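Hi Q.,

Before the meeting this afternoon, I wanted you to have the zinc ion prediction in hand. No need to reply - just skim if you have a minute. The sequence and ligand are here:
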Amino acid sequence: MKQDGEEGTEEDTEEKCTICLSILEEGEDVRCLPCMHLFHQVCVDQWLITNKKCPICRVDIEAQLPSES
Ligand SMILES: [Zn+2]
Ligand SMILES: [Zn+2]
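Predicted structure with the ligand bound:
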């Protein structure tokens, strides 16, 4: 069908899925975690269920870090 790529500077914060190792295209309801990383909403919503630790940073995020309601 179609493909896309990247354009910008990216150090180590917001680039591609790393929980699953895939991509994050804009337009979907993705999620950002405060552990300087973002992944598919489902991916975080599973990695915090079956696990409890930042995929890259490996510090236990414990959840409830950012405000929720
Ligand atoms: Zn993912
Ligand atoms: Zn992180």
